[PDB]
């Protein structure tokens, strides 16, 4: 049936214990007004009843001889692709990411649809979690998380709303093996004529470490304002941060600053993480940015995709293959993919805040992925446990980063 | 110090399809008057027991080429040690889904290859253990041991430790025809449990009182073997019909004593036909008793290996039989009710039984793949109903 285009090939390719493929989202409901006691329970109870299935939750891998592709999964299993589970006492935040760290760990099963949502109950405070689990050979990042916008609507007072499994690389080519398709790098590399070493970007272990929080936008809007910056540039100056006080507290802060890999286009942004004071920071790096993105202005697609690629090459090889150091281009990603600017419920029950789930590759430890909904901006740092010891904390580091700028300019 | 190569074999079988870790299923009551936050409380005094003992703090690596064990310097307790609940309404069917979800899920090499997860939200005033260490490191019978080994039979006794902190194929497969055609110089059905499997799970646990089972066996001159045999031939045989999927010959167990392979009678109508057919099959099975034993099963492992030898499938399902604990034990006042083992599946061996036994009872813990075996907890009834029909049959 329907084949698997050379992207989604490649995620499953790359795909090993320590690095699962696979993205996720957490979603954070309240209870709908006057709900039982037992909310959850009676939630979890429909839904699985709910078994109509559509495309692309329905869909399953298989091969025709020797070449990968999609199939309608005749026998699908809704009790194994979702689930009911609880938080240990005291169920607070903190249990929750725990949570979604364990579960984010897990491979998926390649031979079922690769999705799973999980109901989460034993919050505190009458409130209950979604945290939902896709492969990104099936579901890409974006589209994903729109999905699960899209599975929203902005009417409390509406019920009997669906569960979203029924909702209304240039040059690359094959399979090969790791070093057939990294000769084939160096060739693209060397007849296209011919980042500091970090903790980050060092081979990692398959368990993860999931940092999720929400901040207030006008409380951002403040410190644009104040200094003449973006939104973008702000949360982007959290981060580095954020980062800078990590890598501190471990005593493996390096010398040259960080650089992020930063969606906008790509942008590869110095974080200047050697920079001290806070509004030095930022607006090193808001010029940095803003003139790192001019340098598309005079481009078009076809020439943007054609330097994206070729500049970003060498890191590939490095990524795959952790034999160019000096290639490693960048020291993180910094993924910036807006979200819905009103509300939303779920058959009354409010969402409180979305957070993605991305993913971390062998020498990108850290993958800190950002988005927005309404009043708020919304951050999701996953990263692999060993390596990036006590990464909840930077939660308090970004935190930290915008209060400096706060003070710094006496807001 | 380098892995024994049967360590190396279990590192070498595992795939995303199968794991290659054993686990234990440990229920506990209580401890007497304690409070209703006692797992809580029991949970944050166990994140701080941090020193761990061999084999616990061992962890894989390699010396060029080779796999060796070495001690783990910097050993995450949190990563380990797990501490989690049930979901609403807190049954052993929720504790049953439970196990069979974390039960699928790999383990990471790059730690010592264990972990325990002390589970909350039990219904009536009970948690539960569930232990899972990889093979390799731990074998199921050493596990077990290790799992009772930890507990004792003073419920008086406290202060006790928890388990961590105590006292190419081609090429292979060729290689194996070869050690079949050097050997057969010597002067099993096809059947749905022997497909390719799914890394995905489904365990189902229950206990069996040994003196119901022993009624039986004086009425019919059984052992008690025979009748906890009889009751899995009895459920396969039920959960095989429900499923359209009945061979004409008879399923054939390989059951470990030495290795027999015990035929199941699955084609037997009557309950006590298949009770005396198994204890006479299984008595001249071993009458005729580590050379003949594995030369007669590598044509079983050249068809695991490879589905590429469809006769020499040689037996449907695993039947292992470990014996445990005479006598009630507690864990720091809190008495083990159940212990259940969860074993391994592969290709062509969807379905695992083991089977231990402790103080009054004998458990039957079956690991099934969950696409293979869909409603595989319904073996659990037929199990029961196997036994009820050889009472029913015997008038008791
Ligand atoms: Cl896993
Ligand atoms: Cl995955
Ligand atoms: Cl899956
Ligand atoms: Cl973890
Ligand atoms: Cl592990
Ligand atoms: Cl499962």
Redesign the interface.
């Known amino acids: 049936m329907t084949p698997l285009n050379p992207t989604d090939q490649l995620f499953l390719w790359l795909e090993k ?2 690095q699962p493929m696979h993205v996720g989202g957490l979603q954070l409901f309240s209870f709908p007004e006057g709900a039982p006691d ?1 909310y ?2 009676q939630l ?1 109870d429909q839904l699985r009843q709910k078994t109509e299935v559509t495309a692309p939750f329905n869909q399953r891998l298989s091969y025709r001889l020797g070449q990968p592709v999609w199939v309608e999964d005749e ?1 699908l ?1 809704l009790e ?1 692709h979702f ?8 169920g607070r935040i903190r249990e929750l990411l725990s949570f979604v760290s ?1 579960e984010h ?3 998926m ?4 649809p690769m999705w799973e949502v999980h109901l989460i ?2 919050l505190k405070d009458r409130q209950f979690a979604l945290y939902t689990k896709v492969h990104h050979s099936l579901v890409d990042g974006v589209s994903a998380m729109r999905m699960a916008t899209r599975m929203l609507s902005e009417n409390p007072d509406e019920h009997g709303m669906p569960p979203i499994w029924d909702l209304p690389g240039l040059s690359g080519r094959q399979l090969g093996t790791i070093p057939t398709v990294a000769k084939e790098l160096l060739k693209t590399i060397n007849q296209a004529r011919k980042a500091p070493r970090c903790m980050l970007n060092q081979k990692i ?3 993860r470490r999931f940092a999720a929080q929400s901040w207030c936008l006008k409380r951002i809007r403040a410190v644009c304002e104040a200094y003449g910056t973006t939104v973008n540039d702000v949360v982007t100056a959290m981060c580095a941060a954020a980062l800078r006080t990590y890598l501190m507290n471990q005593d493996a802060l390096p010398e040259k600053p960080l650089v992020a890999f930063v969606p906008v286009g790509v942008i590869l942004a110095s974080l200047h993480t050697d920079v001290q004071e806070a509004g030095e920071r930022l607006l090193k790096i808001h010029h940095g940015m803003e003139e790192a993105k001019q340098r598309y202005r005079h481009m078009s697609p076809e020439e943007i995709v054609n330097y994206t690629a070729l500049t970003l090459a060498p890191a590939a090889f490095h990524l795959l293959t952790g034999l160019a150091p000096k290639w490693q281009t960048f020291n993180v990603v910094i993924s910036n993919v807006p979200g819905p600017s009103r509300p939303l419920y779920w058959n009354g029950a409010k969402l409180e805040g979305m957070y993605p789930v991305s993913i971390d590759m062998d020498r990108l430890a850290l993958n800190m992925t950002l988005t927005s909904y309404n009043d708020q901006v919304e951050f999701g740092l996953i990263g692999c ?2 390596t990036l010891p006590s990464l909840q904390r930077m939660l308090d580091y970004l935190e930290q980063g915008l209060a400096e700028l706060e003070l710094n300019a006496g807001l």
């Open positions: 214990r320590q037992d959850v329970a979890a026998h299993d194994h689930r009911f589970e609880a938080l240990p006492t005291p364990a760990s897990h491979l099963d390649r031979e079922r109950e034993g272990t398959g368990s446990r060993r």
